[PDB]
Amino acid sequence: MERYENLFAQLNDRREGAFVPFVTLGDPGIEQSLKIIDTLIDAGADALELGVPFSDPLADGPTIQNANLRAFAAGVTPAQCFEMLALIREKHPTIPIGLLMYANLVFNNGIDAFYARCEQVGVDSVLVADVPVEESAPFRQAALRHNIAPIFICPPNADDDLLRQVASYGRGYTYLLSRSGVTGAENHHLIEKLKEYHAAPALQGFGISSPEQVSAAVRAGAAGAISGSAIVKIIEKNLASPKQMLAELRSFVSAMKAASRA
Amino acid sequence: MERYENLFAQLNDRREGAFVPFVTLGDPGIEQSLKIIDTLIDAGADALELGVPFSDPLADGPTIQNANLRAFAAGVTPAQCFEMLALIREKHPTIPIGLLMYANLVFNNGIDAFYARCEQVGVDSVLVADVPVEESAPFRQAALRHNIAPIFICPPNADDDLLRQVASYGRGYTYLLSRSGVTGAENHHLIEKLKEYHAAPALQGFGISSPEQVSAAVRAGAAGAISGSAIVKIIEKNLASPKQMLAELRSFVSAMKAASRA
Amino acid sequence: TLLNPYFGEFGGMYVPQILMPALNQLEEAFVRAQKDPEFQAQFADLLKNYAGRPTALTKCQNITAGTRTTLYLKREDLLHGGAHTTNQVLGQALLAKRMGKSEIIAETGAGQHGVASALASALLGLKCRIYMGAKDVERQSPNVFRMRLMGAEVIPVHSGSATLKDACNEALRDWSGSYETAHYMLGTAAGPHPYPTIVREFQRMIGEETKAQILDKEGRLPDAVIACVGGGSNAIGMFADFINDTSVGLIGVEPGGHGIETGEHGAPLKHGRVGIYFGMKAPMMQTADGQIEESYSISAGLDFPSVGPQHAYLNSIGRADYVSITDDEALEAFKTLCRHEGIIPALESSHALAHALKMMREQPEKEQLLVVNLSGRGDKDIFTVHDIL
Amino acid sequence: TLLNPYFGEFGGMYVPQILMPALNQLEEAFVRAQKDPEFQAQFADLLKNYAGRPTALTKCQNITAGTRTTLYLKREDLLHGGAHTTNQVLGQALLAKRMGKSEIIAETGAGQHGVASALASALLGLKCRIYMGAKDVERQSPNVFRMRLMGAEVIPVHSGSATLKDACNEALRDWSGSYETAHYMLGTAAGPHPYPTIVREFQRMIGEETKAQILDKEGRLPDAVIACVGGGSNAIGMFADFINDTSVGLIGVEPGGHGIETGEHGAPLKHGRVGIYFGMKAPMMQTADGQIEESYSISAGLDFPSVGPQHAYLNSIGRADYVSITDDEALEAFKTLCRHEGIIPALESSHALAHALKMMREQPEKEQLLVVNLSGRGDKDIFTVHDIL
Ligand SMILES: Cc1ncc(COP(=O)(O)O)c(CN[C@@H](CO)C(=O)O)c1O
Ligand SMILES: Cc1ncc(COP(=O)(O)O)c(CN[C@@H](CO)C(=O)O)c1O
Ligand SMILES: O=P(O)(O)OCCCc1c[nH]c2ccccc12
Ligand SMILES: O=P(O)(O)OCCCc1c[nH]c2ccccc12
Ligand code: NA
Ligand code: NA
Known part of the structure; x- marks a missing residue:
């Protein structure tokens, strides 16, 4: 729940925008994923968006699909994710952690049991990528019960009824989709209406590449911008030169966060 | 026409039976087919049955099919057959020559024109293997017009109406079928009925192998026996040892003709 | 001949004399089947509900x-x-069993009459041998195994030129032996009378x-x-x-x-x-x-x-x-x-x-x-x- | 939802929020087509005289x-x-053109729904891309080329496990982009509502x-x-x-x-x-x-x-x-x-x-x-x- 309120509230005074990186837990190995998340934070990441490896990523294009394949070769189960998550929180007590999930992984041993270990591990929000607002009820009711922020997507093709629903249901932040498709490092009116309905701080979606895109997003009305594509490509590229990976990572996060004002 | 009457009439006094070999004209080459027919005659062949190479031998099983293939490699056309036939007659003026034909070869340039070159070359009878008595009329009328004996087959499964028809139409001899199928060197009541109708001297059909079969055929009522299968196998076997071919030929014809009394 | 064998000058029955009783038997079978209501009833049923x-x-x-x-x-x-191909093959196999026959011979080139003989035999309890030639076996290998699975013998002709022509011949040679047990299911509206008429009435x-x-x-x-x-x-x-x-x-x-x-x-x-x-x-x-x-x-x-x-x-x-x-x-x-x-x-x-x-x-x-x-x-x-x- | 998405507890529409207007549009199209006499007339004609x-x-x-x-x-x-497969594919392609759409996406495993989408598209003037996975392409190569000849794109999945499962996913990913021009012809009576109901009414x-x-x-x-x-x-x-x-x-x-x-x-x-x-x-x-x-x-x-x-x-x-x-x-x-x-x-x-x-x-x-x-x-x-x- 709370960590987000503080971040947006203190970012507000800094007249900064949030820069949330996205990374798959486990890609390419436990120890080395954990060093990537500390390097990200220490380079300027305002919050984290973390994905747990699912076999059938319906909303994820190729980099993230390869990323999942990577944690899967590394042996990262659901439970070793939760084990990493409690470790991240144990050493970074304040940064908001959001989880990017697929529905079956949440449903497996009970929806409520899932939100319960999330609360136990110190996770703040959960976005379930394939549960639309109209099927969300047991998911949002279980998250509210464990003080987990239910994140919803607001797509390009959104209408009023939906905008008021996601404004009434979501908490933490609103994922605002800036394109269509599935994730990749290739390929304003809505924001005001959100702010009229008093929805959570819209962060921007798929298709953020440009450092200036963050700038654009921030003055356009968005409180911050999420990026995963980019971050992962580097993990894929410099995977043989680990120190160099860390280094270029440290560079883009610094570089993107540096662009987070406009 | 006539040569047959004399043969059966003089064989009659000798109380012998006729032994007619069958050979494909041209197999394996012109010159060498011609030496096979003189060796046959000089070994005891009473009459000859000669086949002209047809591409689609419907009534001929494999040896004769290979035999045809052989003359065809040798280049023996219809016209080079007729050329060989006038040469055979020019040096063996008395032996009856019968031709074993297929219908298209006779029909090609006119039925009557075919019987005319037969008469011109000195052939005595023609058997058209695929023209049954009920389709024979232009064929038998053209043969009678050129003093060519129309030969007919009387099969195992013959009835009265047929036996009287083939007795009224045929001349020279009657081909009496002793089996069913197609030609190969593998695989009494009718004869009396033929002799009652006053049909031509029945010679026996497919499936003559045994020297004693000739004997059997002769006393059973048949005036002689035709063999081709055997004769050809030897041509196929000793084809590399030509002199030996001639020799084993000279042997079987002598051997079979020697058995032609009973 | 109950029916005429000629179409103007084309036609007839130019077969070796031994096959001639076989052809007149089939012509008798066809003519009586044509008048039998139980033949057309069985034929129609098999065309509507099986084919x-x-x-x-x-x-x-x-x-x-x-x-x-x-x-x-x-x-x-x-x-x-x-x-x-199937239409005629159903009618000839009911003629074959009406004449108490039990084997079927056929020839095939695109393999499609092979397959239809193979299926009608399996349906009706008849045994079936087919002749097919080498370049057709090659060009039409799909049909080679459909035919094989239904339990038909493909006897693979290459007695000379290996084609339908050669298959046709091989099939007539075999039926010159077999004709008292076996029926020849000829594939087209050609060959000796009455097959031009029978195949036309069945198509x-x-x-x-x-x-x-x-x-x-x-x-x-x-x-x-x-x-x-x-x-x-x-x-x-x-x-x-x-x-x-x-x-x-x-x-x-x-x-x-x-x-x-x-x-x-x-x-x-x-x-x-x-x-x-x-x-x-x-x-x-x-x-x-x-x-x-x-x-x-x-x-x-x-x-x-x-x-x-x-x-x-x-x-x-x-x-x-x-x-x-x-x-x-x-x-x-x-x-x-x-x-x-x-x-x-x-x-x-x-x-x-x-x-x-x-x-x-x-x-x-x-x-x-x-x-x-x-x-x-x-x-x-x-x-x-x-x-x- | 005009029609209920659940069969007891099974069902629903668990798709990314962006595809949700697409599904309710198709549900509207289906319901109005179901009442349109010119839709059932066109549907019936295509089932009797083409199929x-x-x-x-x-x-x-x-x-x-x-x-x-x-x-x-x-x-x-x-x-x-x-x-x-053909029955449903004819009904969905008339729904697709009734909604003014012009591309068709589909997935196939035995290749048989691939071929039926390929034929209905060629018949109706729609363009068609298919996803198929590697061991199915192998096991069902017949269908791979029937599909190809009728001018359909076989996009050969091996994004992970390369099977129908993988094809399915790849097809939903693409339709998450294309949904305003392209219709997704899903192959079975499964996936998100109303496809369980539409595929059942069309079979x-x-x-x-x-x-x-x-x-x-x-x-x-x-x-x-x-x-x-x-x-x-x-x-x-x-x-x-x-x-x-x-x-x-x-x-x-x-x-x-x-x-x-x-x-x-x-x-x-x-x-x-x-x-x-x-x-x-x-x-x-x-x-x-x-x-x-x-x-x-x-x-x-x-x-x-x-x-x-x-x-x-x-x-x-x-x-x-x-x-x-x-x-x-x-x-x-x-x-x-x-x-x-x-x-x-x-x-x-x-x-x-x-x-x-x-x-x-x-x-x-x-x-x-x-x-x-x-x-x-x-x-x-x-x-x-x-x-x-
Ligand atoms: C679909 C199709 N249409 C037509 C024909 C030609 O024959 P038709 O002239 O008899 O009607 C064939 C050949 N049918 C024969 C000959 O090769 C068979 O054994 O397969 C065919 O395959
Ligand atoms: C003849 C036949 N009968 C049945 C099925 C199974 O599907 P059904 O359960 O939907 O009815 C299939 C598969 N149909 C799908 C899935 O692989 C296709 O794309 O080919 C089939 O090939
Ligand atoms: O465009 P990218 O690669 O920067 O990713 C976008 C970030 C979060 C994200 C990753 N995978 C998802 C699947 C569905 C919805 C959102 C996500
Ligand atoms: O049994 P075989 O080989 O001795 O031949 C028999 C002899 C004549 C003969 C050769 N080929 C034919 C085709 C049809 C009718 C008769 C013949
Ligand atoms: Na032709
Ligand atoms: Na299943």
Whole structure:
């Protein structure tokens, strides 16, 4: 729940925008994923968006699909994710952690049991990528019960009824989709209406590449911008030169966060 | 026409039976087919049955099919057959020559024109293997017009109406079928009925192998026996040892003709 | 002969004398079966509930665009087994068991009459041996194993030229032995009488369903019905109920091969000489000295060097016109029917379609109602058409 | 939602929020088309004259010998394209063009829904891309080129596990971009609402023709109708008009694979756990921690690890029983139907037949009228079945 309120509230005074990186837990190995998340934070990441490896990523294009394949070769189960998550929180007590999930992984041993270990591990929000607002009820009711922020997507093709629903249901932040498709490092009116309905701080979606895109997003009305594509490509590229990976990572996060004002 | 009457009439006094070999004209080459027919005659062949190479031998099983293939490699056309036939007659003026034909070869340039070159070359009878008595009329009328004996087959499964028809139409001899199928060197009541109708001297059909079969055929009522299968196998076997071919030929014809009394 | 063996001068029974009782027995069987209500009842039941008759009459809505040609297709491709061959094979196997017979011999070239004999035997409890020749086995390997799975013996001819011609011969040789137990299920409307008449009476439903269908749809009879001609059954199946409707043109299409002038064609009725072979007198492809010359077509099912006698006769009196279609024009109409109508035709039936497309293309303002007989589906052909790239 | 998305607890629309307007648009299109007489007129015309409906109901006369089981077969194998897939594909492509759409996406595993999308597109003027996975491309190469010739793009999946599962996913990813021009022709009665309802209403004719046919023939309704279950369309096509005739048993048959105990099977409804995937909540094959586990079957068309929601529901209330059939029992019933009846069945439909033969064999004195749905022909399968020697 709370960590987000503080971040947006203190970012507000800094007249900064949030820069949330996205990374798959486990890609390419436990120890080395954990060093990537500390390097990200220490380079300027305002919050984290973390994905747990699912076999059938319906909303994820190729980099993230390869990323999942990577944690899967590394042996990262659901439970070793939760084990990493409690470790991240144990050493970074304040940064908001959001989880990017697929529905079956949440449903497996009970929806409520899932939100319960999330609360136990110190996770703040959960976005379930394939549960639309109209099927969300047991998911949002279980998250509210464990003080987990239910994140919803607001797509390009959104209408009023939906905008008021996601404004009434979501908490933490609103994922605002800036394109269509599935994730990749290739390929304003809505924001005001959100702010009229008093929805959570819209962060921007798929298709953020440009450092200036963050700038654009921030003055356009968005409180911050999420990026995963980019971050992962580097993990894929410099995977043989680990120190160099860390280094270029440290560079883009610094570089993107540096662009987070406009 | 006539040569047959004399043969059966003089064989009659000798109380012998006729032994007619069958050979494909041209197999394996012109010159060498011609030496096979003189060796046959000089070994005891009473009459000859000669086949002209047809591409689609419907009534001929494999040896004769290979035999045809052989003359065809040798280049023996219809016209080079007729050329060989006038040469055979020019040096063996008395032996009856019968031709074993297929219908298209006779029909090609006119039925009557075919019987005319037969008469011109000195052939005595023609058997058209695929023209049954009920389709024979232009064929038998053209043969009678050129003093060519129309030969007919009387099969195992013959009835009265047929036996009287083939007795009224045929001349020279009657081909009496002793089996069913197609030609190969593998695989009494009718004869009396033929002799009652006053049909031509029945010679026996497919499936003559045994020297004693000739004997059997002769006393059973048949005036002689035709063999081709055997004769050809030897041509196929000793084809590399030509002199030996001639020799084993000279042997079987002598051997079979020697058995032609009973 | 209860029925006449000749169509004008074409026809007859030019078989070795031993097979002659067999042919008159079959003619007796056919005539009595034709009058037996329990034969037609059993026949009709097997056509409706096992084979799936009536087949549809499809209007083409896209290939004729920009012309004034309306084109329908009679859907023989939708028959069980995948082709018109099945209709006749059901009638002859009931004749075979009515005559107390128990083995069946047949010959096949596109493999499609092989498969239909294999299925009717398995259905009716008859044992079945087939003759097929080497380049057809190759060109049509799909059909080779469908046939094999239903428990039929494929005896793989290469006694000489290994083709339908050679299969035909081999099948007659065997039946010259077997004829008292075994029935010969001959594949086309050709060979000795009564097979030209029997195969026509057992394929007649094709043309009588077309007549009923088009009259209900269009309110009027076709201007022409078009069908390919290998030996002639699907074509005489189609033409038969229309012969007395003079208004209706009947066009038979023969394989033009690499083009008539190459000599590599399979068009006897318009580019051969009458001859006597396979128990009949009919146009064929033969040497000047009378050897039976082999034919050619990209489609295995039309590679026969003679044609059925009722066709040679319909041409001479000018009631039917016969035309030719090269390999390439058949291939082009195969491609075009897939791509604009979603029907993959057998390459034999494509010859009839390429001729109806020619008619439409040469004279676009001619208003004309045509019907092609889409005699088979092209599943046997897709491997072959793909290897032409 | 005009129509309810759930069958008891199974169903729903668990898709990314962006696809949600697309699904409610299709639901509107379906409901209005269902009431439009010009839609049903166009639909019926295309089923009768292009596809060849009604298909026959064949009585078996030899396989049931020595038992008291009467067995009929509904002949979906005789439909244009060679399988039940065609019925639904004609209805969805008229929905697609009614919604002004112009591209079509689809996924295929046995290749048979690939081919039916390829043919309906070519017929109706729509452009078509298909996703198919590597071992299916291999196992079903016949269908790969039929599909290709009619001008459809086969985009050959191997994004992970390369199977129908993977094709399905790839197809939803693409339609998440394309949804305003492109319609997704989903292959089975599964995935997000309204596809379970639309695919059932567009396959319903199978079961309503069976009911009319058997009553005329037998004077009475079956004791059971049997159909195989990959995701569930042919089975719900069959079962649908009988659900209220309680007398009639409905048996769905799932691939038993190398046998349930091996783990190499494809039977989610009786040996899986409910999960959420492919836009629905339904039984599936998943790891203990919830990864979607792949299935197995010798037949490509039944290799899907979940099942359509109306089936999961018919089982829980006990209106339908679902059973399993190993590779080997399907192979044995393939062989036996060829050899005794001359019909080569698709290996998917053989699973339903092997279960009706089991019923007949275990209890030979039980008098029982059965109907199996012979959902496809086995021409795609003959190369594969031959390589099991
Ligand atoms: C679908 C189709 N349409 C037509 C024909 C040609 O024969 P038809 O002239 O007899 O009607 C064939 C060949 N049918 C024979 C000969 O090769 C067979 O054994 O397969 C065919 O395969
Ligand atoms: C003849 C036949 N019968 C049945 C099925 C299984 O599906 P059904 O459960 O939907 O009815 C299939 C598969 N149909 C799909 C899935 O692989 C296809 O794309 O090919 C089939 O090939
Ligand atoms: O465009 P990218 O690669 O920067 O990713 C976007 C970030 C979060 C994200 C990763 N995978 C998802 C699947 C569904 C919805 C959102 C996500
Ligand atoms: O049994 P065989 O080989 O001795 O031949 C028999 C002899 C004549 C003969 C050779 N080929 C034919 C074709 C049809 C009718 C008769 C013949
Ligand atoms: Na021909
Ligand atoms: Na399944």
